[PDB]
C-alpha cells in the first residue's frame, strides 16, 4: 500500500490520539457552555482597527493594567434591524466557551444603554488580507502553513458541533509568532445537522447556501478550498464585480487554476471545491483525515503546528504593545451611549 507498516501504525495511533484530544475538549467546552465582566470607562479608546455593517473593532487600553485589547462594539438597535440578535448571542457565547491556540480569546463582555461590547486579545500583526494583497500571492509552503492551522481549527470546532461560516483572509489575524488567530464569530452557530440561514461572504459561499438548501458543516470545508486557492493565487476562484455574478460562477462550479499551481494543490482544491456533497472532502466517511492525509499536506507535521513549533514563514514587525502599524486607517466614529436603555428584552441574556 501507500504506507509501510511503521508509517501506518504511526498514523493510526495519531488518529486515535486526536479522538482522545477531541473527547476531552468537548467535555471542557460543554462545562463552560453550561456554566459561563467590565465596563466602558475601564478603557481608553485608541484606534479603529476595522469596521463593517455588523459592527466595529477598536484598539483600547485597559486603564488599571495598561494591557491592550481589541474591543468589538455593536449597536443594539442596529443588531435588531439587521436580524442579528441570535447571531450576536451566539458570538459571545461560543467565544466564551471555546479554547484553541488559533481562536482569538475573549477577555470581557458587557453592555450599556446603546451597545454591546466584546473585549478580545489584541493581535498586532494585522489581517492576513493586508499581507496577501501587498505581496500578491503566497508560495505553496506559506499557504500550506496557514491552511494547516485552519484545518485543525475546523476539526476542533466541528467536533463541538460548531460551524464557523465566515472564513476569509479578512478574519484571520497574524500573531507575533506568525501564527493565525481566527476572529469574528458573528455567524458561528451550534448545529448538530442542518441549518438554513443565508449568511457568509459571497466569494466564500458554498453552492448549497446560495441555492437555499438546509446545509451543514461542510460549507466550512468548501470555504477552506476558497481560502487556499486565494492564498496561493492572490484572488479567489469565483471572482466578479458583483455578488449576483459571483453566485452564478459558484453554482456553475467550474474552477480554473493558475498554471503555477502544483498538481497536488489542484487535486486538493477539486475535492474541497466539490459541488456534490457525497464527494466533498471533510464530508466523507474518513472525515477530516481525507484532508490531513492528502499529498499536498504530506510535509505537514500536524502536532508541531498545533504546538506552534514550526517556524513561521512570516513574522510581523512589532513596534510595541499598542502599535497599530499593521492595520489600515478608518474614519473614527463616536461611541455614543443614550441616556435611555435600548432593546433591553432582546439582549437580556447577553
Amino acid at each position: 500500500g501507500h504506507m509501510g507498516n511503521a508509517a501506518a501504525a504511526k498514523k493510526g495511533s495519531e488518529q486515535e490520539s486526536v479522538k482522545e484530544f477531541l473527547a476531552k475538549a468537548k467535555e471542557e467546552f460543554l462545562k463552560k457552555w453550561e456554566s459561563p465582566t467590565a465596563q466602558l470607562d475601564h478603557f481608553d479608546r485608541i484606534k479603529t482597527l476595522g469596521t463593517g455593517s455588523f459592527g466595529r473593532v477598536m484598539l483600547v487600553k485597559h486603564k488599571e493594567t495598561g494591557n491592550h485589547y481589541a474591543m468589538k462594539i455593536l449597536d443594539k438597535q442596529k443588531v435588531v434591524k439587521l436580524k442579528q440578535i441570535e447571531h450576536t448571542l451566539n458570538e459571545k457565547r461560543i467565544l466564551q466557551a471555546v479554547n484553541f491556540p488559533f481562536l482569538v480569546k475573549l477577555e470581557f463582555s458587557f453592555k450599556d444603554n446603546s451597545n454591546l461590547y466584546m473585549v478580545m486579545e489584541y493581535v498586532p500583526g494585522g489581517e492576513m488580507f493586508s499581507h496577501l494583497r501587498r505581496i500578491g500571492r503566497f508560495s505553496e509552503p506559506h499557504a500550506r502553513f496557514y491552511a494547516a492551522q485552519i484545518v485543525l481549527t475546523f476539526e476542533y470546532l466541528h467536533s463541538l458541533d460548531l460551524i464557523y461560516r465566515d472564513l476569509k483572509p479578512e478574519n484571520l489575524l497574524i500573531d507575533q509568532q506568525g501564527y493565525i488567530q481566527v476572529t469574528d464569530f458573528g455567524f458561528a452557530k451550534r448545529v448538530k445537522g442542518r441549518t438554513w440561514t443565508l449568511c457568509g461572504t459571497p466569494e466564500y459561499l458554498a453552492p448549497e447556501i446560495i441555492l437555499s438548501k438546509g446545509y451543514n458543516k461542510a460549507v466550512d470545508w468548501w470555504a477552506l478550498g476558497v481560502l487556499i486557492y486565494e492564498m496561493a493565487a492572490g484572488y479567489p476562484p469565483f471572482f466578479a464585480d458583483q455578488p449576483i455574478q459571483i453566485y452564478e460562477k459558484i453554482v456553475s462550479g467550474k474552477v480554473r487554476f493558475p498554471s503555477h499551481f502544483s498538481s497536488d494543490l489542484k487535486d486538493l482544491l477539486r475535492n474541497l471545491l466539490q459541488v456534490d456533497l457525497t464527494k466533498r472532502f471533510g464530508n466523507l466517511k474518513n472525515g477530516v483525515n481525507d484532508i490531513k492525509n492528502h499529498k499536498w499536506f504530506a510535509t505537514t507535521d500536524w502536532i508541531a503546528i498545533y504546538q506552534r513549533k514550526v517556524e513561521a514563514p512570516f513574522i510581523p514587525k512589532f513596534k510595541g504593545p499598542g502599535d497599530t502599524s499593521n492595520f489600515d486607517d478608518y474614519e473614527e466614529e463616536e461611541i455614543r451611549v443614550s441616556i435611555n436603555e435600548k432593546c433591553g428584552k432582546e439582549f437580556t441574556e447577553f
Binding site: 479578512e170 443565508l198 461572504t201 471572482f239 453566485y247
Partner: peptide
Amino acid sequence: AGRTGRRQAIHDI
C-alpha cells in the same frame, strides 16, 4: 475582473 478590497458579509440573498 473582481473585488480586490475588503469584502462585507451578507445576512441574506
